[PDB]
Each structure stands twice: as structure tokens, then as C-alpha cells.
């Protein structure tokens, strides 16, 4: 009487990006009394599907490739209708479900090919250097976003979180021995073997200077020989400290402490000269004669707060 399909429901399945497919589904209804099959509904891409009568079966096919990434939930739902040659005609419908399988046809990508980040050199071991974010456009969780594994190459001093891409430190750093780093970041998807795909970006890290070094004396204590009664302004010797920090933090400021009337230095050079106070080698005064032949010098950098050398340094003078 009414065309009745042999099943309550039908099914077919294929990968995305298939050229065509000749038999997603075979259906058949039966009339005791003829039958024409039609696709009456389609959740999506109806135009791509076709039905034909082959050897008594209504046979669904698909003529274009499908894109998994343009389909919600991997499923296309069709409704097929069998209809007799009746006047009026009689019909019956049935659900068909087309599963589309995802292919790994999208690579992980980064917003930029190179990222640039600056960071103070006293960064707390394990702190957030940089959040990274790759994007994989495959829709399935197997091949798309959820599947991304971050990897990091370069210095053992850094490490990346494999799921979130958050980059972090392995240790305390030191601008005074490593100033910059170039790291390579790989994102990879859940494809297997040659179908695994990978995204890449460099991360270029610069260390900003902290005033984390004291001045220290080069070649102290100093020994000079100097003639008796030498004129005012005669060159004596040069003192030197070293601060390997940058700019202000490495800039040195020398001074004589406590004061010494027989000598003056240049605070920016450390170049000691004599004063108008004359150097009598056989001078009565004990105190005055002792600092005639010994100069104590201190040195500070221009940081904030400014650091200074642990020790002072001495110029031992020997008069002639
Ligand atoms: Ca696709
Ligand atoms: Ca895909
Ligand atoms: Ca992918
Ligand atoms: Ca310093
Ligand atoms: Ca420093
Ligand atoms: Na340092």
C-alpha cells in the first residue's frame, strides 16, 4: 500500500576532500501493489548529493568533495522519500546520516614568524616570559586546535609548557654573560607520520640591565715611586675599578676618602695629580708625612641606589 523502507534509518560515511563517491547509501522501499526516491532535506551541501535508481535500489552519491571544517559535528542529515506512481501518490520518508571524517588538512600557525620580548635580568626563576598561541584550523579535536603540542629549542635556561605554550625560565639569568637569546618554537598537530603538520616561530629575548654588580679594583693595591718636592699638578698615577653593568650602573665615580691635601684625583678618570701642598720627604709632622706617602681611594657607580666597591684601595707612594 504505502512505500515502506526496509530500515528505520540509513547511514553512509566518507572522508573530506574525496573527489566523488558512488555509493554512500543504498535504500529500498516496497509496495504490495513504481517507486521513485528523492532527497527532500539536507542539513548542508544539498547540491553535492544526488540519488539515482540502480538495480531496484535508491542509491545516494556525492559528486564534489566536502570540507569537514565547514560542517558542524561531522554529520550531514538527509531525508529520503519513496513515492509510488499513485493518484494521489503515497510516500514515506526516512532519515539518512552521512558521517564526514576529518582529514588533517590544516597546519598550526602563529600570528607572527618572530616574536620579540624584553625582560629584566633578575627574573624570578620560573616566571612568565611569554604567552604563545598557535592556531590550527582543523575542526576535529584530533587534528585541530585541541591537538597542538608546543616544543622549544635553544637554551636549557628556558622551557615551554607543552599544552598552553606559556614560556618560562629554568633559572636566574645574567646579562653580564648572556645578553640575548634566539629560541625556536614548534607547534605540532595530531596528524601521524608524514601527515603531522607543524608551525614555527622564533622568539628573540633581550635582557634589560639591573645594577647587580659592585665596582671592583683592577691591580690594587697600587705601588708608585714619586720624586720629593715635585711641582703642583704633576701626574702621579691612575686608579681603576670595573663595573660590568650598563650606562649609569656601570659608570664609576672615584674620590679620596678621607681627604688628602697632597693629592687630588679626577672623579671621572681616577687620574691622581699633586697639589700646591709640597712634598718634603724629611717633613716633621707624623700624620702629615704618612698621607704624603699613602692615599686611600673609594669608588661608587651611578646606580639607584648607587653601589660601591666593598674595599677601598690604596696607593702606596715611595718618596725620593
Ligand atoms: Ca577541509
Ligand atoms: Ca580537516
Ligand atoms: Ca591540523
Ligand atoms: Ca653596578
Ligand atoms: Ca647588570
Ligand atoms: Na647579572
Curated annotation (Swiss-Prot):
The identity of this protein, by name, is: Cadherin-23
Q: Which gene encodes it?
A: CDH23
- UniProt domain Cadherin: residue ranges: 6-110, 111-223, 218-320
Domain of life from the UniProt record:
Eukaryota
Quaternary state and interactors:
antiparallel heterodimer with PCDH15. Interacts with USH1C and USH1G.
Tell me which residues are glycosylated.
91, 133, 204, 249, 266
Expression tissues: Particularly strong expression in the retina. Found also in the cochlea.
Compartment(s): Cell membrane
Which residues of the whole protein are included?
Answer: 557 to 881 of 3354
Q: Which cysteines are joined by disulfide bonds?
A: none
The lineage is: Eukaryota, Metazoa, Chordata, Craniata, Vertebrata
Amino acid at each position: 500500500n504505502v512505500p515502506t523502507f526496509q530500515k528505520d534509518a540509513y547511514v553512509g560515511a566518507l572522508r573530506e576532500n574525496e573527489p566523488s563517491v558512488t555509493q554512500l547509501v543504498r535504500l529500498r522501499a516496497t509496495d504490495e501493489d513504481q517507486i521513485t526516491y528523492s532527497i527532500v532535506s539536507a542539513s548542508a551541501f544539498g547540491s553535492y548529493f544526488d540519488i539515482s535508481l540502480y538495480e531496484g535500489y535508491g542509491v545516494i552519491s556525492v559528486s564534489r568533495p566536502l570540507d569537514y571544517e565547514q560542517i558542524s559535528n561531522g554529520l550531514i542529515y538527509l531525508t529520503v522519500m519513496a513515492m509510488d506512481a499513485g493518484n494521489p501518490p503515497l510516500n514515506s520518508t526516512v532519515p539518512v546520516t552521512i558521517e564526514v571524517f576529518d582529514e588533517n588538512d590544516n597546519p598550526p600557525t602563529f600570528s607572527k614568524p618572530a616574536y620579540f620580548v624584553s625582560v629584566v635580568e633578575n627574573i624570578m626563576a620560573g616566571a612568565t616570559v611569554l604567552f604563545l598561541n598557535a592556531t590550527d584550523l582543523d575542526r576535529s579535536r584530533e587534528y585541530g586546535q585541541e591537538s597542538i603540542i608546543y616544543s622549544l629549542e635553544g637554551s636549557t635556561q628556558f622551557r615551554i609548557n607543552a599544552r598552553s605554550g606559556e614560556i618560562t625560565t629554568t633559572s636566574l639569568l645574567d646579562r653580564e654573560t648572556k645578553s640575548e637569546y634566539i629560541l625556536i618554537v614548534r607547534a605540532v598537530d595530531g596528524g601521524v607520520g608524514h601527515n603531522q603538520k607543524t608551525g614555527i616561530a622564533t622568539v628573540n629575548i633581550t635582557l634589560l640591565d639591573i645594577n647587580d654588580n659592585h665596582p671592583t679594583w683592577k691591580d690594587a693595591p697600587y705601588y708608585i715611586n714619586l720624586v720629593e718636592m715635585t711641582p703642583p699638578d704633576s701626574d702621579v698615577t691612575t686608579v681603576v675599578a670595573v663595573d660590568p653593568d650598563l650606562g649609569e650602573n656601570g659608570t664609576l665615580v672615584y674620590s679620596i676618602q678621607p681627604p688628602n691635601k697632597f693629592y687630588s684625583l679626577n672623579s671621572t678618570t681616577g687620574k691622581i695629580r699633586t697639589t700646591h701642598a709640597m712634598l718634603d720627604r724629611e717633613n716633621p709632622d707624623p700624620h702629615e708625612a704618612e698621607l704624603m706617602r699613602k692615599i686611600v681611594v673609594s669608588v661608587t657607580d651611578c646606580g639607584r641606589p648607587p653601589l660601591k666597591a666593598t674595599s677601598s684601595a690604596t696607593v702606596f707612594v715611595n718618596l725620593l
